[PDB]
């Protein structure tokens, strides 16, 4: 309710996709601010470069430009203010990184500053002349990782479904690329440093209930069992408070592909 | 447009003579004065061909344009409306386009003849010096230099480069200013890209007006244009113009894209550059005034400077400020014949221009340049062909001064046309006053048939 219901005609599928993306493009900032606001409180006085990067991972480009003018990094503030749509600046940083790597001037710049230049250039990983790699999504949660996919690795015009598929393309085992997105968990496992070392029984990796709902919105036949399991919601396998009230909304939304054992286990 | 092609052809011929004169050969002084005289004539025909086209189109469209502004318009579409709405802004930009075209024609083919010392990296000699200072074999003197290699390090550390890179940066920044002074901002971006400054090529794109066409909910997907923080970017570029640690040319580059006339005039070192600095900032300031009246931005907490937002502009004012300047060159150029014509054609003031022609004839008649008397004549014929009024006593006396040139530089023949451009009493009297000198019988018959090719009253003439 607010941007579509103003329209005195049946709203085009494009405008619905656009405003549903504009709403989710707020949700992916509001989910990130308290960790960014703690990270900046710690980093600001030791490294303004990490504090500027943290603001950019929440789309706080105005605060990032403000902190760069406060730190004495005025060409970083200029560069960041211009990045709010302009693809020519993305391709000019794409060239500038290709210059510095070939000319071995990359190893004469801060890896933390090269991480900002890679983010802006729309590069999730950069490969340096040292054979170091800078992963832009390193140390982050899934929401900021998926927001990097939604804001810096894709155009203003793409769907949520492409940002979420590029995020799933970034944390699985392929034959041709290393993992760079975090495989990315319920809000009680964020920040933990837990690289899940692929549990040799658990053939389904745990994920957040909000990711399970985004799968069920993208695919009407996606699994309900992992969506309603309390481990996707809380640090407690006994808290069915949200699990039952989600199912007794999905049953009202005419989703009907749960098993009667699984409904029986939820209700009991 | 053909008068510009004739003058530009003779400027081409005279340039292809002056470029072949041995320096100091005092015979070629007239050749160089004739080159500059016809170069200033060529661009004065260019100026006329733009401003009088706009002024006649406007005077045929003004009955019709009941426009309505859209509540959801972007900066681009407010300015797309402004350039329809506003003949003062439109004619002011035609003076910018004109003055940038003059600087472009003086640059010509030359852009790729620029040798630098650096040839594989940006700041290559300072980069090499740092890579050498990292080696434990450095038994060199430690000249104070930057220790970082971002382009802000000289201003953040307040330390120098080594002087090869410090020559190339000063060379490059003049060429970048000279290209922007010629409207070649895309070539300044390409020269930045060519010199490894993809960062400065990006700053040279930040002034672009914002647009998202997809706001209107289209049928396919279109690109987003410009910079939605163009205001904050201009505030930042104004800050780069006013610290004395920036080069005069880098300050002028950001000033010519952010309205800072006060930091632009410190590089504008011709009359044309000084007129250009006023007109380029007058358009940019009037554009900011329509945008900040029409585009309701929210929660922005910094101002563009009140010396530039509070700037009242008129065409007359610019040509008083151009007479208050300390730049003695501009004060001497602002007294020559074509720069005076250029002021009056920009103002549209034909009344003061005919008093200039009177103020010139009454002092200088016998001594005026023959091509200036050809120009003054053909400008009066152009105004008459458009039905535009002139001080006809002075128009008659320009035409009579020209007929007296045409007799006395040596032509006889072309007098008939420049005499049928008079009322019959005066056409008869001035052609008779010419034929009252013709003694050669073959020349008499020839000068009657040339009058019979020009619809003259041969019978009252004889």
The neighbouring-strand residues paired with A144 are none
Q: Is B369 on the interface with A (CB under 8 A)?
A: no
Nearest to B217 among A12, A79, A93 (CB): A12
Gap between the Cα atoms of A180 and A191, Å rounded: 16
- Contacts of residue A107, defined as CB under 8 A and 6 or more positions apart, other chains included, come to A128, A129, A130
Q: Do A92 and B198 touch (CB under 8 A)?
A: yes
Kindly state whether A114 is in contact with chain B, defined as any CB-CB distance less than 8 angstroms.
Answer: no
What 3-state class would DSSP assign to A30? helix
Structure-token pair, residue B323: 């007479």
Closest CA to A69 of B252, B148, B240: B240
Query: Per the CB < 8 Å rule, is A157 touching B221?
Result: yes
Q: Is the dihedral of CA B225, B226, B227, B230 positive or negative?
A: negative
Q: Which residues of A touch B120 (CB under 8 A)?
A: 103
Taking residue A186's Cβ as centre, other Cβ atoms within 10 Å add up to 19
Q: How far apart, in whole angstroms, are the C-alpha atoms of residue B322 and residue B328?
A: 11
Residues 146-205, chain A, touching B (beta carbon < 8 A): 156-157
Distance CA B287, CA A23 (A): 33
Residue among A116, A134, A138, A112 at smallest CA distance from A125: A134
Residue with tokens 């092609």: B5
Alpha-carbon gap, residue A26 to A147, rounded angstroms: 10
Contacts with A82 from chain B: Cβ below 8 Å: 202-203, 205-206, 227, 229, 233
Alpha-carbon distance B278 to nearest alpha carbon in chain A (angstroms): 26
Question: Which residues are within 8 A (CB) of B461 and not within 5 positions of it... i.e. 6 or more apart?
Answer: B428, B431, B432, B435, B451
Interface test with B, best of A81, A106, A113 (most B CBs within 10 A): A81
Instruction: Report the alpha-carbon distance of residue A24 to residue A12 in Å, rounded.
Output: 18
Chain A residues in contact with B198 (beta carbon < 8 A): 92-93, 95-96, 99
The CA dihedral of B176, B182, B186, B191, to the nearest 10 degrees, is -30
Other C-beta atoms within 10 Å of B368: how many? 19
Q: Which residues does B266 contact at the CB level (< 8 Å), separation at least 6?
A: B248, B251, B252
Q: Rounded to a whole number, what is the distance in Å from the CA of B245 to chain A's nearest CA? A: 14
Is the minimum CB–CB distance between B213 and chain A shorter than 8 Å?
no
C-alpha torsion sign, points B80, B86, B90, B92: negative
Residues 75-104 of A with CB under 8 A from B: 75, 77-79, 81-82, 84-89, 92-93, 95-96, 99, 103
Say whether residue A9 is in contact with chain B using an 8 A CB cutoff.
no
Q: Is B224 on the interface with A (CB under 8 A)?
A: yes
Structure tokens belonging to residue A219: 């695919």
Q: Given CB atoms, is B449 within the 8 Å cutoff of chain A?
A: no
Residues of chain B neighbouring A75 (CB-CB closer than 8 A)? 150-152, 199
Which contiguous run of DSSP H or E holds residue A23? helix A13-30
Q: How far apart are CA A169 and CA A179, in angstroms?
A: 9
Q: What is each CA distance from B430 to B396, B399, B425, in whole angstroms?
A: 10, 10, 9
Residue A225 neighbours by CB under 8 Å, 6+ apart: A258, A259, A262
Please state, as a whole number, how many other Cβ atoms lie within 10 Å of the Cβ of residue B5: 11
Q: What gap in Å lies between CA B101 and CA B108, rounded to an integer?
A: 11
| Neighbouring residues of B76: CB distance < 8 A, sequence distance ≥ 6 | B209, B210, B211, B225, B226
DSSP state, residue A225 = H
Closest CA to A85 of B214, B288, B37: B214
Using an 8 Å CB-CB cutoff, list chain B residues near A97: none
**CA-based nearest distance A223→chain B, Å:** 33
- Given an 8 Å threshold on Cβ–Cβ distance, is A81 in contact with B130? no
Interface test with B, best of A49, A60, A86, A104 (most B CBs within 10 A): A86
Task: Kindly state the tokens that stand for B314.
Answer: 């008129």
Q: Which two tokens stand for residue B411?
A: 């032509």
CB-based contact A85 B151, cutoff 8 Å: no
CA distance A96 to chain B (A): 6
Cβ(A33)–Cβ(A57) below 8 Å: no
Q: Give the residue on A whose Cα is nearest the Cα of B153.
A: A73
Helix H or strand E encompassing A125 = strand A125-127
A65 lies within 8 A of chain B by CB: yes
Quick one: three-class SS letters along chain B?
CHHHHHHHHHHHHHHHHHCCCCCCCHHHHHHHHHHHHHHHHHHHHHHHHHHHHHHHHHHHHCCCCCCCCCCCCCHHHHHHHHHHHCHHHHHHHHHHHHHHHHHHHHHCCHHHHCCCCCCCCCCHHHHHHHHHHCCCCCCCCCCCCCCCCCCCHHHHCCCCCCHHHHHHHHHHHHHHHHHHCCCCHHHHHHHHHHCCCHHHHHHCCCCCCCECHHHHCCCCCCCCECCCCHHHHHHHHHHHHHCCCCCHHHHHHHHCCCCCHHHHCCCCCCHHHHHHHHHHHHHHHHHHHHHHHHCCCCCCCCCCCHHHHCCCCCHHHHHHHHHHCCCHHHHHHCCCHHHHHHHHHHHCCHHHHHHHHHHHHHHHHHHCCHHHHHHHHHHHHHHHHCCCCCCHHHHHHHHHHHHHHHHHHCCCCCHHHHHHCCCHHHHHHHHHHHHCCCCCHHHHHHHHHHHHCCCCCHHHHC
- Alpha-carbon distance of A145 to A137, in angstroms, equals 6
Partner-chain contact B120 A109, CB within 8 Å:
no
* CA A239 to the chain's CA centroid: 27
């Amino acid at each position: 309710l607010k941007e579509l219901d103003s329209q005195l005609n049946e709203p085009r599928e494009y405008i619905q996709i656009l405003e549903r993306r504009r709403a989710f493009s707020r949700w992916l900032s509001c989910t990130a601010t308290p960790q960014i606001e703690e990270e900046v409180s710690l980093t600001q006085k030791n490294s303004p470069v990490e504090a500027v990067f943290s603001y950019l991972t929440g789309k706080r480009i105005s605060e990032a430009c403000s902190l760069a003018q406060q730190s004495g990094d005025h060409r970083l503030a200029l560069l960041l203010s211009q990045f709010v749509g302009s693809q020519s600046v993305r391709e000019l940083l794409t060239m500038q990184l290709v210059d510095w790597h070939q000319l071995q001037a990359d190893s004469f710049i801060q890896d933390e500053r090269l991480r900002i230049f890679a983010l802006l250039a729309g590069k999730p990983v950069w490969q340096l002349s040292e054979k170091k790699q800078i992963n832009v999504c390193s140390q982050l949660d899934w929401k900021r990782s998926l927001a990097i996919h939604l804001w810096y690795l894709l155009p203003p015009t793409a769907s949520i479904s492409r940002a979420l598929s590029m995020y799933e393309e970034a944390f699985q085992n392929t034959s041709d690329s290393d993992r760079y997105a975090c495989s990315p968990l319920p809000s009680y496992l964020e920040g933990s440093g837990c690289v899940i070392a692929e549990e040799q029984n658990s053939q389904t990796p745990l994920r957040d209930v909000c990711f399970h709902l985004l799968k069920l919105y993208s695919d009407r036949h996606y699994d309900l069992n992992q969506l309603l399991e309390p481990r996707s919601i809380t640090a407690d396998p006994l808290d069915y408070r949200l699990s039952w009230h989600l199912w007794e909304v999905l049953r009202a939304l005419n989703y009907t592909h749960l098993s009667a054992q699984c409904e029986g286990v939820l209700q009991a | 447009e053909e008068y510009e092609n004739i003058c530009g052809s003779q400027v081409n011929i005279l340039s292809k003579i002056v470029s072949r004169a041995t320096p100091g050969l005092q015979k070629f002084s007239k050749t160089a004065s004739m080159l500059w005289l016809l170069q200033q004539e060529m661009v004065t025909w260019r100026l006329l061909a733009s401003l009088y086209r706009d002024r006649i189109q406007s005077a045929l469209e003004e009955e019709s344009v009941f426009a309505v502004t859209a509540v959801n318009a972007s900066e681009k579409t407010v300015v797309e409306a402004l350039f329809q709405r506003d003949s003062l802004v439109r004619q002011s930009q035609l003076v910018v386009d004109w003055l940038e075209s003059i600087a472009k024609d003086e640059i010509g083919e030359f852009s790729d003849n620029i040798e630098f010392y650096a040839k594989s990296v940006y700041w290559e000699n300072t980069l090499h010096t740092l890579k050498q200072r990292q080696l434990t074999s450095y038994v060199g003197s430690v000249r104070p230099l930057v220790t970082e290699l971002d382009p802000d390090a000289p201003i953040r550390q307040k330390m120098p480069l080594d002087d090869l890179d410090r020559e190339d940066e000063v060379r490059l920044l003049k060429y970048l200013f000279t290209l922007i002074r010629a409207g070649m901002t895309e070539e300044a971006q390409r020269l930045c890209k060519r010199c490894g400054q993809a960062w400065r090529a990006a700053t040279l794109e930040g002034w672009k007006l914002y647009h998202d066409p997809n706001v209107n909910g289209g049928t396919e997907l279109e690109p987003v244009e410009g910079n939605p923080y163009r205001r904050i970017w201009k505030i930042s570029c104004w800050r780069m113009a006013e610290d004395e640690l920036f080069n005069r040319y880098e300050r002028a580059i950001y000033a010519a894209l952010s309205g800072n006339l006060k930091q632009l005039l410190p590089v504008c070192d011709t009359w044309e550059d000084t007129v250009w600095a006023y007109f380029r900032v007058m358009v940019d300031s009037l554009v900011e005034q329509e945008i900040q009246t029409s585009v309701a931005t929210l929660d922005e907490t910094e101002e563009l400077p009140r010396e530039y937002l509070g700037a009242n502009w008129t065409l007359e004012k610019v040509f008083e400020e151009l007479q208050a300047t300390d730049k003695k060159r501009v004060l001497e150029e602002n007294q020559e014949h074509y720069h005076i014509v250029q002021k009056f054609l920009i103002l549209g003031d034909i009344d003061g221009l005919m008093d200039e022609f009177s103020k010139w004839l009454s002092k200088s008649r016998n001594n005026l340049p023959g091509h200036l008397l050809r120009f003054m004549t053909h400008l009066i014929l152009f105004f008459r062909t458009l039905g535009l009024q002139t001080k006809e006593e002075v128009s008659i006396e320009v035409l009579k001064t020209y007929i007296q040139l045409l007799i006395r530089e040596k032509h006889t023949n072309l007098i008939a046309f420049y005499t049928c451009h008079l009322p019959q009493d005066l056409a008869v009297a001035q052609y008779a006053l010419f034929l009252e000198s013709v003694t050669e019988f073959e020349q008499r018959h020839h000068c009657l048939e040339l009058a019979k090719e020009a619809d003259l009253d041969v019978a009252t003439i004889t």
